[PDB]
Each structure stands twice: as structure tokens, then as C-alpha cells.
Amino acid sequence: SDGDTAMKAFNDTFWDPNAKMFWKDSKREKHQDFWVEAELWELVMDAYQHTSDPALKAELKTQIDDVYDGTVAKYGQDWTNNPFNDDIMWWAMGSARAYQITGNPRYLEAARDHFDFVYDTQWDEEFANGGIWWLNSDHNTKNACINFPAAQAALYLYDITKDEHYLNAATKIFRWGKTMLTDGNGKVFDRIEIEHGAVPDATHYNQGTYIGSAVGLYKATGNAVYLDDAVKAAKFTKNHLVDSNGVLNYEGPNGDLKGGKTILMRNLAHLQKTLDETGQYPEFSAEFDEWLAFNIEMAWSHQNSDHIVDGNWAGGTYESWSSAAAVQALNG
């Protein structure tokens, strides 16, 4: 049970049962950033779905509710006072998943109300012919880190509700994003800035949410073009966001990007499952599976004696966001 071992060690090192939040690092001086906390929430959910130890499973199910409670105690229930639309949407997506797992109606209202605020008021047709703004304060840029997560959140809400409103939203957001925030061959651009144009800088987490939304659209629509879209973005990641031995890059020193492999790995697992089930792209599937396994083994060979792995997978304080990626990789 390497996935169980990895998750237990992550909790032992970083979980604060008193505040019901993760610590930012092993000094236990400061709790994790708001948007990153939603991604650690999803890690708890993924370990819950992966494990077959019923005692650990029940423990992780309780933790799903505690993570939300601790964040609500510090930040409130209404997140629309946060000027970052991406922060809001990461929590809306997490809330949709928490509803799928628990059935607790507070999570459905949280997902729906926050999705609606962003989509209904922060979509604009004028600048760049579409897209959602990064912030709800100033309107200067439209970014991959809000647009693709918004498509993914719409797809979860469609699965829950069967309301075509959400499928129509996902289709519209993704079409815009593919056209304005990619090169058409799987390279995902960070953002488009008013008075400048596209900033074509690719990162692990934006490759990830593009891939996850494309796989979700394939499943919901039956259009094979969406699967092709996801494969091209996975090939780009494997060939161009890696070191000379094929190990995924380290994206520091930026604090938001350092743990981005967590989001990438979560979404690559969705593509791997869809390829295994459909038997499509058999040649790429075999190469992709082998490359993933090589990455996981190299990462875990760098673990310390407490079973924690730093985010520099190619080589004394450990950080929760950087260290999460190796745990996610064993819970997919």
C-alpha cells in the first residue's frame, strides 16, 4: 500500500487537527495558502477513492469535512469577497467533488453559487472574443488557471445535475480556451493580456487542467476530437516540460508553481484510465504508462526516512505543496 503509506506520512508531517488546515511547511509556523488548500482537499479525496483499508478510508472521509470546516472558520462561507476568480473556482470545483463523495447539500450550494458568480458575471465577449477574467477587481488579463478549472467545474456540475446549462458552459469555455490559450498542438499558454496579447509560457498545472477538461468533454459528448486534444497536450508535457532524462521539471522558485505536478498528475491519471478503457491510441498509451511509472519510481527513490518526497524529483525543511505531488502520484 505505497499510496496509503504516502498519505499517512503527509498527514503526520503537515496536518493540523486543531486548526483543521494543512501547515505550509514542517516548521508548523504558518498554514497553507487558500487556493493551494483546495488542491490538498482534492488530494484527501483522491486518497479516499484509492485506498482499500476501510479504517483509513473512514478517517479520510471525515477529513474531507474537516478541511472545509477549518477553511470556513478562517475565510467564511461566501468566497465572493476574494478578488481572485481562480481562488473561487478552485474551491467551487473541490466543493462539487465533496458533494459527489458525501451527499451533504452544503457542498452542492457552495459549488453552484460560486460557479454562477464567476461564469455569469466574469465572462466577457469583447476582449479576445471571449473568456473569463482572472480577477473580479481589475479586468486586465484572462488566464488558463481560471478558464480550464471553470470548464472542469461545469463538467462536475453537469454530472451531478444533468442540467444542459453546465454542459453548454463547459463546451463554450473550452472552445475559447483551445483557440486563444493554446497553439493547437497541445502547448497551453499562461494568459492573454489586454494591450499586449498572449503570454505563451507553459506550466505543469495548466497542461493538467486543459487535459482534465478535454477528457471530461470526450466522455460527456462522444466527440473524439476532445480525446485527440488531451493526447496532444500530454505528448507536449512528456517531451517539453521534462529534464534531459525525461523526469518532470522543477518549477521553483515561484511558490504557486513549485507544487504544480500535483495538479498535472491528478489529470494525467484521468487520461490514462480513459485510454486503458477505450483501447484508443494503443502505441502512445504504452509509452505514456512507461514514462509515468519511471517518473513515480524516480520520485520515490528520493524519499526521506519519514516517507516524504521533496518536489525536486531529480534530487532540511519540507513544504506541503512541493511534497504533495509524490503522494498524488501513488493515489491515481
Give me Rg for the CA atoms of the chain. 19
Q: How far is the CB of 87 from ligand 7K2 (least distance, A)?
A: 5
Under 8 Å between Cβ of 18 and 28: no
Cβ-based nearer residue to ligand 7K2, 78 or 289: 78
Can you give the binding site for ligand 7K2, defined by CB under 6 A?
A: 35, 84, 86-87, 143, 145, 190-191, 203, 254, 256-257
Report d(CA 148, CA 181) in Å as an integer: 10
Cβ-based nearer residue to ligand 7K2, 237 or 285: 237
Instruction: Give, to the nearest 10 degrees, the angle between helix 320-330 and helix 261-278.
Output: 10
Amino acid at the residue 306? D
Strand partners, 319: 25
Cβ-based nearer residue to ligand 7K2, 5 or 137: 137
What value, to the nearest 5°, has the Cα angle with vertex 35 and ends 31 and 41? 75
- Cβ neighbors of 9 (< 8 A, separation 6 or more) are 306, 307, 308, 327
Report d(CA 168, CA 164) in Å as an integer: 6
Task: Give 179-227 as a DSSP string.
Answer: HHSB-SSSPBPSEEETTTEEE----HHHHHHHHHHHHHHHHHH--THHH
- Cβ neighbors of 105 (< 8 A, separation 6 or more) are 99
Under 8 Å between Cβ of 266 and 327: no
Cβ-based nearer residue to ligand 7K2, 115 or 148: 148
Task: Give 273-324 as a DSSP string.
Answer: HHHHHH--SHHHHHHHHHHHHHHHHHHHTT--TTS---S-TT----BHHHHH
Q: How far is the CB of 255 from ligand 7K2 (least distance, A)?
A: 8
Cβ-based nearer residue to ligand 7K2, 71 or 331: 71
Cβ-based nearer residue to ligand 7K2, 146 or 170: 146
Cβ-based nearer residue to ligand 7K2, 35 or 75: 35
